[PDB]
């Protein structure tokens, strides 16, 4: 546990979900830098 009050469900295994979520969070926090520098 950590902070998953809800539940995506629908599909996608376990370790495949935790991992994929990191990838999006990383590229999201990154692309923002490309913006901060106009």
């Amino acid at each position: 546990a950590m902070a998953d009050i809800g539940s995506a469900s629908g599909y996608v295994p376990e370790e495949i979900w935790k991992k994929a979520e990191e990838a999006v969070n990383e590229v999201k926090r990154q692309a923002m830098t490309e913006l901060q520098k106009a």
Partner: protein, 50 residues
């Protein structure tokens, strides 16, 4: 700083899930090309529904 500042600028809500929905497939599927695997993934999504 007003119409764009939330720690990550302002990622349009829902985008997180969209990129995730595809990534989860890449990890478990592992395609030859990411661009070619995506183009088909997004077309199928829309063409599938309205």
């Amino acid at each position: 700083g007003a119409m764009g500042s939330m720690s990550h600028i302002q990622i349009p809500p829902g985008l997180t899930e969209l990129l995730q929905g595809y990534t989860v497939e890449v990890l478990r599927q592992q395609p030859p090309d990411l661009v070619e695997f995506a183009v088909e993934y997004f077309t199928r999504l829309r063409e599938a529904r309205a």
